[PDB]
Amino acid sequence: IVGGYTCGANTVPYQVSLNSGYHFCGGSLINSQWVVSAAHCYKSGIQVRLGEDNINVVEGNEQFISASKSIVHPSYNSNTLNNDIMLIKLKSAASLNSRVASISLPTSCASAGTQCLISGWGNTKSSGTSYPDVLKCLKAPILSDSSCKSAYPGQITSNMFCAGYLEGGKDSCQGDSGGPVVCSGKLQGIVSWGSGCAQKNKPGVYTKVCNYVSWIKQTIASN
Ligand SMILES: [Ca+2]
């Protein structure tokens, strides 16, 4: 997250870190046994780390649970990033508490202008590299479809939305991928892609979660 703030320990209780020897992507806990992330975060050997603040220090609220099954969206296209969503099932159910909690799925899509909370352990610099140990947060509005398409001609599908600031300076960045965009208490987005980070006229692009609620629910119901 570039241009954000330190969230505070365990203040984003649905935020997970995906770990394969190190943090490599975010995700969102959607029930005791399932995490939503980005399909482009897929790999084998995932351990889901819940209850994290500093990802390099055991601080006492963590739960580390291996993935038992990954399910990349049936229509994910890694070239265009259309349908950039996957589900991860945990080998055991997380123990839910005030610091480890699921985030509601949306029953309705969100509109341009709605404020949202974007979070992660990604790079905090738009030129150069500095990775935080503690969770970072950014409040950002959803941008209109028309301004998203004007920023990224030929690249925005109906499964994507932009959020952030056209003036630059505030955005998600490398290492935030797969993490949450929460608006009014609902998971509306997944950190997906953008051209660089925090550049003028290049806002972040996010997977439009409301389009996937039916798939998420029926996948969970049979897996
Ligand atoms: Ca920790």
Side-chain angles (χ1 to χ4, degrees), residues 130-162:
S130 182
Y131 286 85
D133 298 308
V134 301
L135 187 67
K136 294 285 176 180
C137 275
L138 175 63
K139 291 182 177 184
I142 300 177
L143 299 170
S144 65
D145 189 51
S146 64
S147 75
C148 192
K149 288 176 171 166
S150 292
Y152 295 104
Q155 302 159 69
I156 304 303
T157 74
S158 66
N159 303 306
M160 297 172 192
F161 67 94
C162 291

Side-chain angles (χ1 to χ4, degrees), residues 51-60 62 64:
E52 287 282 18
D53 190 44
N54 192 315
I55 51 165
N56 279 321
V57 179
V58 176
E59 297 177 305
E62 298 90 349
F64 294 175

